[PDB]
Amino acid sequence: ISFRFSLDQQANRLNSAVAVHGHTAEAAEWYVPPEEYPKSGGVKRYLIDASMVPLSIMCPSYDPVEYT
Amino acid sequence: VHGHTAEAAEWYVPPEEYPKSGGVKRYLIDASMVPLSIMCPSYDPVEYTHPSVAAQPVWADPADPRKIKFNVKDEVNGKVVDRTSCHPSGISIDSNTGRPINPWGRTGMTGRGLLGKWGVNQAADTVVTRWKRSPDGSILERDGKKVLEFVAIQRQDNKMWAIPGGFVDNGEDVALTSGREFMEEALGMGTSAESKDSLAALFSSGTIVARIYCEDPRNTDNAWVETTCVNFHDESGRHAARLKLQGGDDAEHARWMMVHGGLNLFASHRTLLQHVTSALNAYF
Amino acid sequence: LTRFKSYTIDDLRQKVAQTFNPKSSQQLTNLLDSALECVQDPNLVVVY
Numbered sequence: 426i427s428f429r430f431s432l433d434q435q436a437n438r439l440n441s442a443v444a445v446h447g448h449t450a451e452a453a454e455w456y457v458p459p460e461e462y463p464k465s466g467g468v469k470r471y472l473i474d475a476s477m478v479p480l481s482i483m484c485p486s487y488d489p490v491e492y493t
Numbered sequence: 494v495h496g497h498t499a500e501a502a503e504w505y506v507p508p509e510e511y512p513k514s515g516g517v518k519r520y521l522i523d524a525s526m527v528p529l530s531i532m533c534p535s536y537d538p539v540e541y542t543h544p545s546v547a548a549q550p551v552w553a554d555p556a557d558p559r560k561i562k563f564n565v566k567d568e569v570n571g572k573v574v575d576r577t578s579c580h581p582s583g584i585s586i587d588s589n590t591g592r593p594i595n596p597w598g599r600t601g602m603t604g605r606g607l608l609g610k611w612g613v614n615q616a617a618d619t620v621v622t623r624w625k626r627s628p629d630g631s632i633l634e635r636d637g638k639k640v641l642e643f644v645a646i647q648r649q650d651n652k653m654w655a656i657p658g659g660f661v662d663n664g665e666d667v668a669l670t671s672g673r674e675f676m677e678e679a680l681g682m683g684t685s686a687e688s689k690d691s692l693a694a695l696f697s698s699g700t701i702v703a704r705i706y707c708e709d710p711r712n713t714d715n716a717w718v719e720t721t722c723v724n725f726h727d728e729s730g731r732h733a734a735r736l737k738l739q740g741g742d743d744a745e746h747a748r749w750m751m752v753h754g755g756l757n758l759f760a761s762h763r764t765l766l767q768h769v770t771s772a773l774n775a776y777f
Numbered sequence: 778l779t780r781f782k783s784y785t786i787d788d789l790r791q792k793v794a795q796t797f798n799p800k801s802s803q804q805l806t807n808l809l810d811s812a813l814e815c816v817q818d819p820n821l822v823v824v825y
């Protein structure tokens with residue numbers, strides 16, 4: 426049955442998941458770090474949204490902290 | 494061996510009784526007088542429009558064909574329509590009345606009939622396929638080729654079997670149309686949160702099989718259906734096993750069927766089954 | 778099974794035209810569609 430399944434497994438594209446799920450975006454999942462820096466002793470960074478993550482977006486209210 | 498036997502020149506001829514017309518008969522013609530490349534001087538077709546189409550619904554074009562631009566994408570009521578054919582010569586318009594002429598051959602009936610739109614009724618078909626597997630798990634093989642299962646619905650109009658599909662909505666693409674037709678007709682959704690995610694994973698991979706003129710009985714000289722076939726193949730079969738089939742909207746019963754060469758389906762769906770078994774290299 | 782892999786449409790059509798003799802294309806098409814319509818559910822047919 427393993428040899429028969431191995432010989433069975435040896436043997437204009439479009440996406441239509443809009444009509445089942447709705448207005449669901451698979452893209453624009455930009456990485457956002459956590460606001461607590463690791464091993465910083467409770468030092469918190471500036472919390473921002475995922476749309477304000479890249480620098481191609483403007484984000485005028487983004488005030489990051491400076492930590493070394 | 495046979496003699497003077499011609500395998501070609503088998504042109505499609507519709508039946509002379511129109512479907513659901515109340516006994517209205519069209520002009521009976523021969524197979525040699527079917528295409529418009531032949532002359533046929535004695536061809537006198539009748540002009541018939543349906544009274545459901547004559548009450549002007551929301552899915553139908555208005556009764557005057559003037560100022561309607563064909564062979565290009567048009568804006569009707571702020572909505573995009575395709576309005577073009579797969580014919581190489583293109584759609585021709587008669588200048589005496591404004592009505593278009595079908596390039597695929599005369600059907601013996603004029604006007605719109607049961608078809609709501611003038612010219613090309615653009616249709617999208619959903620062929621969802623899985624491999625025909627055993628209870629042991631091996632894929633079934635006939636005549637040296639693998640054997641496909643496909644979802645088929647049963648139509649409420651003619652009480653016989655067809656593939657899922659339908660006419661295009663105004664302002665919608667074919668991926669929304671084939672998905673809404675498979676949700677309403679085949680799946681029966683509307684009329685799950687994991688089975689819908691497996692259905693979206695099934696519907697994420699869709700290839701265009703063909704784009705062909707339908708051999709429907711409802712086609713007249715000024716209205717004809719051309720369709721595009723979208724195939725959804727489940728090679729693993731895990732996404733197709735989670736779909737619970739229930740008949741809804743324009744479908745009575747929906748079930749899995751085995752594709753073969755002697756299929757008796759509505760219009761020219763056997764050509765779409767031959768195209769999807771040519772594309773996926775299966776039995777036909 | 779392995780012996781039934783050579784089974785075709787055309788030998789079944791020649792079997793139906795052997796035993797019934799419908800003398801029409803449409804009656805042979807309707808009897809072949811009825812004989813393929815009986816065997817569509819695999820649970821309902823038990824062959825002894």
Ligand SMILES: Nc1ncnc2c1ncn2[C@@H]1O[C@H](COP(=O)(O)OP(=O)(O)OC[C@H]2O[C@@H](O)[C@H](O)[C@@H]2O)[C@@H](O)[C@H]1O
Nearest residue numbers: 552607608609610614616617658659660707709720743760
């Ligand atoms: N352009 C149109 N022409 C006719 N009827 C229409 C149209 N648009 C909407 N309708 C209405 O909507 C319904 C059509 O249902 P669909 O699922 O859109 O189409 P259906 O008739 O179920 O399937 C047609 C299928 O058959 C094939 O010839 C072709 O490939 C098409 O996919 C009918 O009840 C009809 O009243």
Ligand SMILES: [Mg+2]
Nearest residue numbers: 659660674743
């Ligand atoms: Mg519909």
Ligand SMILES: [Mg+2]
Nearest residue numbers: 658659678743
């Ligand atoms: Mg339908």
Ligand SMILES: [Mg+2]
Nearest residue numbers: 659678742743
């Ligand atoms: Mg429908």
